[PDB]
Symmetry: D2
Subunit: 417 residues, 4 copies
Amino acid sequence: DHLMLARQLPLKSVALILAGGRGTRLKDLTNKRAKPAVHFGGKFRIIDFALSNCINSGIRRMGVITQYQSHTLVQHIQRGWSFFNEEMNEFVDLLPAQQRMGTADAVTQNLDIIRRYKAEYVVILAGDHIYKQDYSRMLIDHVEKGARCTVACMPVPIEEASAFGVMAVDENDKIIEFVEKPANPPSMPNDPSKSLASMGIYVFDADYLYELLEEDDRDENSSHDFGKDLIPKITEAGLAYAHPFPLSCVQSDPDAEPYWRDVGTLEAYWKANLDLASVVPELDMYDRNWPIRTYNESLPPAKFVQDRSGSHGMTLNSLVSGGCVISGSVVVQSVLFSRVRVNSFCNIDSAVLLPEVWVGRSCRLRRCVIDRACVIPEGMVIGENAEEDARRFYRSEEGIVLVTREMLRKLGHKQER
Amino acid sequence: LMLARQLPLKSVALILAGGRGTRLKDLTNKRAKPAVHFGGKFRIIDFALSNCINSGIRRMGVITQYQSHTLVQHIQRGWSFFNEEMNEFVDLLPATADAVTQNLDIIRRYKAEYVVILAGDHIYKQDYSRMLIDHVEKGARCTVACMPVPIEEASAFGVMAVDENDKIIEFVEKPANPPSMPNDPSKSLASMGIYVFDADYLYELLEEDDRDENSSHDFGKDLIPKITEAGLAYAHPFPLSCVQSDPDAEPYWRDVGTLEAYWKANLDLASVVPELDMYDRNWPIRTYNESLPPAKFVQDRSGSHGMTLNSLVSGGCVISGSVVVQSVLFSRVRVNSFCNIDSAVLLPEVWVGRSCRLRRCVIDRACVIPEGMVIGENAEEDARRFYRSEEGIVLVTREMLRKLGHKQE
Amino acid sequence: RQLPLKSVALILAGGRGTRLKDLTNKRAKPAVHFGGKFRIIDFALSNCINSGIRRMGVITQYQSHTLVQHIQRGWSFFNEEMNEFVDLLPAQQRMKGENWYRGTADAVTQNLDIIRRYKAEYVVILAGDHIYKQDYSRMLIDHVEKGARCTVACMPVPIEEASAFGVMAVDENDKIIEFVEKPANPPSMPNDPSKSLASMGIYVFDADYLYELLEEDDRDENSSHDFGKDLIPKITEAGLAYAHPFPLSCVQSDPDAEPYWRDVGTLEAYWKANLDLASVVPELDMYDRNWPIRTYNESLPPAKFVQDRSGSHGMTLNSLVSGGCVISGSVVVQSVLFSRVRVNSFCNIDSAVLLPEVWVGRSCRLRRCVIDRACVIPEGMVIGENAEEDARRFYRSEEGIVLVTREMLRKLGHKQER
Amino acid sequence: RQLPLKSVALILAGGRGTRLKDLTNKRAKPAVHFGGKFRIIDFALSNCINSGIRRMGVITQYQSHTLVQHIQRGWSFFNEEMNEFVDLLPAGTADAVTQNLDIIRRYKAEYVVILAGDHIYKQDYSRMLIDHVEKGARCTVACMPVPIEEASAFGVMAVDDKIIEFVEKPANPPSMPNDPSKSLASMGIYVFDADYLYELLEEDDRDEHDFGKDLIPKITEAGLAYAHPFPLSCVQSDPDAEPYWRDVGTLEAYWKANLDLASVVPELDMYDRNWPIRTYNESLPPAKFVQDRSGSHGMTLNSLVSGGCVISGSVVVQSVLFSRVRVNSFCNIDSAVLLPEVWVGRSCRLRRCVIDRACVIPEGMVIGENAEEDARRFYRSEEGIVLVTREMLRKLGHKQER
Ligand SMILES: O=P(O)(O)OC[C@H]1O[C@](O)(COP(=O)(O)O)[C@@H](O)[C@@H]1O
């Protein structure tokens, strides 16, 4: 009755989505947004993936914990994720938390409300990552292994493993050693090029988690963080187990590598968006069997019109969302979000244009990210002069330019934000 | 303006959505005409419904008799967002005047003071609240929206002649020899199939019509002449309530009766300055919004780019290079490499094989065009394989292609 | 989990309910009011939701306006992009003869093109005119484990009532050996002569197998195109049909109790099933938060109890009073009052079912009756005390249960204008 | 009609409701239960819907979870593509609006309607909008005569229908010139020209912050403020009656307003289909009345019994029972307000009291008969109204879990 254990498991589970992430490494992109509220994929926000994974996994009871610049995130939840009939034991609960002087503390603050859920299993999720996963499969593995805490894990390049918690496991996926964000990451025994990293995705026995949080709240030596404090304590007790991500990762092509993006840097964010514009994207957004939902506005179809000279337009490996109006121009390796306006004689290459961007005539944009509702003045060139770009806007080490409404205003260009 | 707001609140809109739309040929064989796709992501009935919402009339009765499911499903998915305790609803009333008479018990329980009769198979923007005001101020029992139409096309409408101040003196339904307006012999004053009724008066009229005698049970053929003869019918000029961004332009209203007119009306939205404004936030048209992916443009098999000239590309589409000119592509349309698409309307889920050329045509839903097919260049070959109109517009359907040998599985 | 996800529920909601007399004159039986605030179809639909089956096709035929409107109001909250929906599937009355009506299977066959596009692996066939709680996910598991092509939910019923159902006989392996539809002399169970093993009209099908079966049945000129009369015997003869004991999946708080299932076939049974909820210990538990029954919820005011005209109290004994009701004193005993029921002063209401919006005039006495929706009872009327007078004015069942409708009251000269 | 379409309603729902004592412990005042199945904020929200204003911004600041949850479950049915929404805007009263000025500007509204979310009343805001435009005012303030002995709690004004003088919460309230027994009071309901309000808030933010204490006097001095008599827009079935408006400030007033709905002719009409009040509607079972342990019937006199309730015989008089309230056998309940999920043990007597949500009253407890004993165990107001809370009962040794 693995199908019975399957169904009965999400029904006794509650998902807690940590959506307080500041996303500091994203620079001005998160100055007035929480990282889970960051735009992605032309019409989505990052938090939509964790929420959609819960729905598709059979977990219809969700608690979204927020802490940093929460308005746009709350509004998004209100407009796209408030379709539930709570009498049927399904809901998306907004659980605000206050900054106190870690991730476990935000859950501890809302512990009274979470206890009233009367859940047997608690699924802890990071709401600022992009991935597809069937949490019901992880729940089964958690129960079959008899674990008190199950941590989703995945091999990552060792040069990037210092940003994660790194672990070493048993013959029966039991965690033996755990270190949080090591400067010198231990490598996997079968492969020195990779480290076994924690994905920030946990399954907990509910009663055990409550006791653990109560003890952690009373501990004066703790930073009240899941990775830095709780997971090592559970590992030392021998009650923590690991869950290989390929067991539950949802992907159309089974021969491909498991998709998971933390979207930590501006370059990684720019890279992840343009992946969807490529011929064969690593992330499949056309899968009807694991759909990602979001707030769907009644935008008009993407409109392509002749330029002022009556000439046509060209498009190469690009995404154009609804409500856009493009006058001829050249759009290459770019992702245009909703209601983006591109005027005549423009050249847009390897660019990410967030919703409501207005691009003036005769502009050239290369290897850049244009923030929401930016009004680009006629003739502006971006991505061709490294020194001039760094003066006017933010320019990353890799050469990716970020443009913001405040930046354009300081330059004297009028803008309606 | 106080009269304005309190007027739609005491009003109920009845939308006749049983239209067969036979003049659209195979396009309406498996759909009712109000369920016909339009504008890349809409159905025709969305305009009448949106006009009601934007006019303050939130109580609607949609009468459906023909090709019900796809229309009913559309209402379910996109027009079932109401809280009926707040006196707002869209009521599915399975069953022109007879269709209203059949549901007279349910309609009476609405307890409406005014009844707005609408045709659900026309494309237009109108503020019904303005027509309601004109109906009350004129003291009329029945008010008929009217508009001048070319006299050579007036035989398809109910033609009227008005008194000094917009009364109804003479009315004839679909005359073979249409009377010309006295102020202009070039155009006849035509009825738009849009009526405002005093509710109690309409109920009595329908009761009488049911009991006698040899009537066609039709609004235009039977009811309107009877009201005109009684002297209780008045006319409402459409420009008084027509909603349009440019006030200097002509009033927009399309009955979408023939394949050519349907093909023409869709491509208007792809032009630089469309006659129909679908970007007006002050009079929005709502519909069922799926979570389609952004329109995707990819290089063709040869790594070459694609070209687009005055075209609409809906969500979920994937276009590999190719040339798209003066065309409207509906949802989930797949266009493969080396294609040339010109002045074409491609309904949802159309799959266009490689190296195809489509010109001046309408491709029906989910058609699988085989590799290399050419349409719109050989008149005799087009007429053999598919339907070809007198004006040269080609309609392609999955059954036509199946009889042609290439399967659509 | 993966089992309900690959399933689609088809709810047959075209039931005439002729044995309910005027109660189904202007509505289909699945649209019949029940429990003070519900309609009968709400149970099958809620069972689907609670079982994890969020893809539903409601097949409607007879008097469907109020049923469709109910679906529109209370069961149109789905995000279809997430593979969840309640689909309205109208079906037309077709006849295989001069007086030969096509049956339940034909209604599904008519919508076979739409149902195929669901791309379901399993099809759950449900009757939308019965009142019960069942976890279909458990039945799906039993269907797969038994390797069956068709699984039929079954339950022992009193043999004197078994002529209304299909009656079966099974293996120790649980395969159906014999099946007879609506026998006038129902075969008794081997372990018990007082009971017959009855079919509950609830089936689980392998989707591809069902499609083939319906295609063949559509081309068969000797078939009445009915699940019970035609398909089930054919599957039984082929040896591909198995039985599912209802207690395996029946949802009930008290495990020591008997499985609850009511077909609500007659006026007396309908009256009886409603009053059960008013008793001290109802057989049907409507207070279970773990298997809730949802319906169209209107923002009714709380039930209002006011003094009568003489300023006296009101008295209530084992009764249900729904929202929007206003009761002026009076005595209400063993009764169920639906939404917006108005009971005026000096009334005595005993063992009565009052459907929504009923207006009871002053000094009325109602006993052992069912009052249809929006009836306006005139001042001083007495019902349920004079058998012959009751039968003259209204409908009176063999057991003495009276049914009152607005049309009956109008023929008597009592205005119903509201 | 075109006036509400260019309008956006901002509902101030941060009220702490201090004068309600433990009733607002762990609750915002707009989230306080009322009418058996409603919360106080439902009236302002329903008024907006029925007035044609379908764009609403709810500003919340104090103990906001239960209020936010209520908005999520009962007021999240909007299709925002059609320019209709209820937005949660976490944040003096003017500062809360100023903090969210960026989001509010993006609404692109022409008129802003400012509402207090902790009052109970029925009003057609569209009529006030018309009066605002016809008078050519920049700010319109809804006003109503109140008894002068209670006028110190309101902003008091005088008018020529243009503002003249204003004073926020005066200890010595000026009486109306035509009648010394009353004072013309502000109802905390304003209509603003949107662009003008934004400029005013910008200036106020830079001035080294309550609508009544700061902004309204400044607008009055400028001569740009006008008054709107409440009877012009108040919605009421009986036109001969007095305009209904309750601030529900004290425990006694809260207890009084609830019991009004239980009377034979309530001052507040909740049966008007033309101006309905919506709320979160759970699929509760019908109110259940069963025989008591002795097989005896139950008695009810002028009382409201909400869904999910189960009453075992007992006598319920002049009381309002909220959802899922259990009353066991042999109980006597008189002039009492029982909030949701209250469990009343057998043989209890409750009189002139308010029982907070989910209280578990132990068998035999008597409340409302001994003043000194009531004041020792619970809170007792000056008028003799008793408030019972789960914490109070647990301090006395009576277990509440459940
Ligand atoms: O009786 P029905 O078929 O349910 O319909 C309601 C009928 O009763 C009426 O109230 C008429 O009743 P009376 O004229 O006898 O008072 C109308 O609403 C309508 O004709």
